[PDB]
């Protein structure tokens, strides 16, 4: 045990040599904590900037990984929103919120919004967090917004601590696990377009209304419509969670990882090449061969 | 004038401990929270400062008429007969009570 | 051609790295591609598209916006290096453009300095009027040349 917490996990362990640790196999995987999250950005009013202004998340503390998907897949949620720079909140917005007193909170500005988000995800310490389009758009906009806001303890997104922001395929959330439903569905099923809407109508057989950002500027001035958008984001989280639970992408990933000897982080990020890469690495080493070095250029862009 | 009751919060329960990073933005960003009615206070005791983030925002008895002062070094602002607490954003966590003050315009 | 010009301008301008046209990044990052007109008519300032090389952006296309850009000069079929901000992915807005350095001049030799002053005739057709076969301008040029001895 080292003197200082090197991560945000509860327990720490230190080892002098790799051979000090070994393998035990005859245990069934524990259930863990799954989390859904939803956030709305909006191309800023003045000139071409993203404004992450909405928060929404679904949590199920004890989530099975070898049994049936829990129904319902959550027991609690929370939402926080803010005015980015000029989108004035409607009259008695929080008053109507507390009148309906459904699980939602307000935040004044973006820095407070993301600070609340980060401390909440810290205290939840999820092991499977899931959102739509986290490969290319939402995770990158998340890191850029925590940059511009200079979010305190920014590295708390992962379970480790790093003072300097990286630049960066996976260096962001070291400790926690991101789940993008669309890529997993792209691996399993055939769909016209892997957008969330079409995925829901093809699999869940339910419609979701697409809300253009070009209309919502006046929409921030009306409490009922803004709360409609907020509950739309809640139903978005619900639909994503329903898709992933029903399609049981998590136990699929577990079995694939146990077959291939890979890292489940890379597995869920995507690429059959990496999983069967680790499989063949295991095979050539157990047959006592020499594996060629990882190719230096790397840098895939898709 | 304007009479607002700012609730008292708890030090290890707050999730947003800092309004920002520089002196000029905290004095403006915090005052935005005053007009939005989303700002709380943490009463000052021993050992409470190391759990909050610089820059700090403090409420000063100007004469409950109060004023806003922000400290960087922490030499002769917190320790006095004029300090009441440290102003922090409200994040919906349950407060303990409410303290009523008056803002001078 | 796009890749060649891109590599040359990258090495000349000390650019960090280009980004795919369909990959949205909030921070201003450089892009690359040749200029084209969206429709099939004459180019309009707001009817321009950007399409890059395949190794960067799969050879895809994206409309451009020049309202934010201060100065520019565009025509279809030219390479450009647009460090525009593309936070969305489906449309970029121009922030600032990079002029393309021309090729270095052909380096002369001592024998080139061993030449004395010379003058050149230049002439372009047509060499006859709209209703003639006589080629009177051609005869006039013949007279000019055999009088001037160029």
From Swiss-Prot, chain A:
Renumbered residue ranges of the record's region DNA-binding: 145-203
Domain of life: Eukaryota
Entry's localization field: Nucleus; Cytoplasm, Cytosol
Record note on domains: The CysA-type zinc finger is required for PCNA-binding.
Pathological association: Pigmentary disorder, reticulate, with systemic manifestations, X-linked: An X-linked recessive disorder characterized by recurrent infections and sterile inflammation in various organs. Diffuse skin hyperpigmentation with a distinctive reticulate pattern is universally evident by early childhood. This is later followed in many patients by hypohidrosis, corneal inflammation and scarring, enterocolitis that resembles inflammatory bowel disease, and recurrent urethral strictures. Melanin and amyloid deposition is present in the dermis. Van Esch-O'Driscoll syndrome: An X-linked recessive syndrome characterized by different degrees of intellectual disability, moderate to severe short stature, microcephaly, hypogonadism, and variable congenital malformations.
Record family assignment: Belongs to the DNA polymerase type-B family.
Anything else known: In eukaryotes there are five DNA polymerases: alpha, beta, gamma, delta, and epsilon which are responsible for different reactions of DNA synthesis.
Subunit structure and binding partners: Component of the alpha DNA polymerase complex (also known as the alpha DNA polymerase-primase complex) consisting of four subunits: the catalytic subunit POLA1, the regulatory subunit POLA2, and the primase complex subunits PRIM1 and PRIM2 respectively. Interacts with PARP1; this interaction functions as part of the control of replication fork progression. Interacts with MCM10 and WDHD1; these interactions recruit the polymerase alpha complex to the pre-replicative complex bound to DNA. (Microbial infection) Interacts with SV40 Large T antigen; this interaction allows viral DNA replication.
Swiss-Prot record, chain B:
Span of the signal peptide: none
Record-annotated CoV Nsp1 globular domain positions: 1-105
Function in brief: Inhibits host translation by interacting with the 40S ribosomal subunit. The nsp1-40S ribosome complex further induces an endonucleolytic cleavage near the 5'UTR of host mRNAs, targeting them for degradation. Viral mRNAs are not susceptible to nsp1-mediated endonucleolytic RNA cleavage thanks to the presence of a 5'-end leader sequence and are therefore protected from degradation. By suppressing host gene expression, nsp1 facilitates efficient viral gene expression in infected cells and evasion from host immune response. May disrupt nuclear pore function by binding and displacing host NUP93.
Protein name: Host translation inhibitor nsp1
Organism listed in the record: Severe acute respiratory syndrome coronavirus
Portion of the parent chain present: 13 to 125 of 4382
UniProtKB/Swiss-Prot annotation, chain C:
Cellular location(s): Nucleus
Post-translational modification, as annotated: Phosphorylated in a cell cycle-dependent manner, in G2/M phase.
Coiled-coil annotated spans: none
Residue pairs linked by disulfide bridges in the UniProt entry: none
Complex formation: Component of the alpha DNA polymerase complex (also known as the alpha DNA polymerase-primase complex) consisting of four subunits: the catalytic subunit POLA1, the regulatory subunit POLA2, and primase complex subunits PRIM1 and PRIM2 respectively. Within the complex, POLA1 directly interacts with PRIM2/p58.
Domain notes: The N-terminal 240 amino acids are sufficient to mediate complex formation.
Purpose: Accessory subunit of the DNA polymerase alpha complex (also known as the alpha DNA polymerase-primase complex) which plays an essential role in the initiation of DNA synthesis. During the S phase of the cell cycle, the DNA polymerase alpha complex (composed of a catalytic subunit POLA1, an accessory subunit POLA2 and two primase subunits, the catalytic subunit PRIM1 and the regulatory subunit PRIM2) is recruited to DNA at the replicative forks via direct interactions with MCM10 and WDHD1.
Record-stated family: Belongs to the DNA polymerase alpha subunit B family.
Protein known as: DNA polymerase alpha subunit B
Gene source species: Homo sapiens (Human)
Gene behind this protein: POLA2
Residues of the full protein shown: 223 to 372 of 598
